[PDB]
Amino acid sequence: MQETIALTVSTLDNPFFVSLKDGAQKKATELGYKLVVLDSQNDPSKELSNVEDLTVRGAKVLLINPTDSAAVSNAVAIANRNKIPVITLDRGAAKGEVVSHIASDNVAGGKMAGDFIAQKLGDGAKVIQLEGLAGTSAARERGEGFKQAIEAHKFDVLASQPADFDRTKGLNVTENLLASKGSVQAIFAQNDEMALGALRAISAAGKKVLVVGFDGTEDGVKAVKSGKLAATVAQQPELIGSLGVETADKILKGEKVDAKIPVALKVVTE
Template sequence: MKKLTLLLAAFLLVLTTGCSLEPPSWAKPKTGGDLNDITIGLSISTLNNPFFVSLKDGVVAEANKHNMETIVVDAQNDSAKQSNDVDDLMQKGVDVLLINPADSAAISTVVQSANTLGIPVITLDRSADQGKVEALVASDNVKGGRMAAEYIEQLLGKDAKVIELEGTAGASATRERGQGFHEVADESLNVVAKQTADFDRTKGLNVMENLMQANPDVQAVFAHNDEMALGAIEAIQSSGKDVPVIGFDGNEDALKSIEAGKLTATVAQQPELIGQLAVQAAYDVLQGKAVEQNIAAPLKLVTKE
């Protein structure tokens, strides 16, 4: 209903301005020299994940440097809630939208609505399947997936039996990390099972318990994020087995687990840097400058050694 109201309002405003295709003045981003009182609308997929908390912190800190206000909303991993949240941000008249999609397909409709209203959109960590996005700021997830598979092969040799814990279905990070992983694993490893655990620690624990029962001879686990990896470790420890687990993100809990000798490795991102780069891109867009469509934050493999 909110979305319909927003689009109807935009349509009526167009009619009252002589059928112009220009967006209403309240929806136009401030550009050029008029960059005072800029408001960023930041929609995060979930703040129940330390990675995205760090990403949010990076956005807010960088925005403060530029005297920008940030309105933060938490989708709680609910794509319908995220769409409504972003509609609300647009109705508040934000100058630019920074969106970390819960679902890359589901977010497309509101991205297109923002396009209609002339509000620039930048996505963080995950892309939108449709609509115009000024820039995607993310790690190279495909490369990170390859790094994980190469490390498992280095650790255990060819044809090692691996379980893959996949992220949320529909998220671009899930597709890309899985793609990179399988570019190597399909040639060098034996992926005996894979199942989604929605980037969630508790689901990672439960899914891992079930997959280990069906695959008792598993030799390694690759999880699409650290939260699932940490859940998998709990399941493995309860079974009394010793199975290497490789995660993805490099969040604080994961790094502590590596130091404690539990998590074997993580493909570490830099979430605060992703947030900072997204704000810098937003500032450039509002100044009318061209920005790269894909802005990459470096990755590194972290182990105890």
């Protein structure tokens, strides 16, 4: 009987997570596993029922990308109680027994983004941060890194506000902030979806604002190459997914794995 590895992804409405899924799928096939992928649709309740389902299906390992690094504890507990090893991908779990966490160094990433803004505009720039989901380690860490850049480069932070990794929210929040914080010079958007929404708001307002994104999605890089998006801190979602499956395979083979597996970042510019 072919063995199954389960992947629960926070959403498939975001190109980044489609890439992560694809990387996990190709590596699963390469190593001889059936990959079962369930979409949490950014909903912790659906995530819980997803983990229940994959469990009754006899998944040998659970790869989970939490909708919320706190809320996910109860979902991890399901796998724990049913003796299914857990690997977290891209976002961590605050509680629950986890074998390995695989993600970018999102603190370094946030600092890279801020450093790039300073390189372009100089110290003392007026900036706005569009934050991701506050409950995720990815957003929290990017904020921490950006704070390091704010202090090092004496940025004037006009606003720092969530748009929940969503393109439409990114647009709406930016539209509002362009009205109230019109002197903003640069925006760090904690993912490319929000970056692209922000760019639409900026253009619609006829304003001049430098934007730095995060992920290096196809759309993100397209916007960078066109000169619309000043830069994006590129991640390797396919590699996060593939490393998840590779790590799952090692666990099942009885081989020890690293507790933390960092995945490299790179600033992509015009």
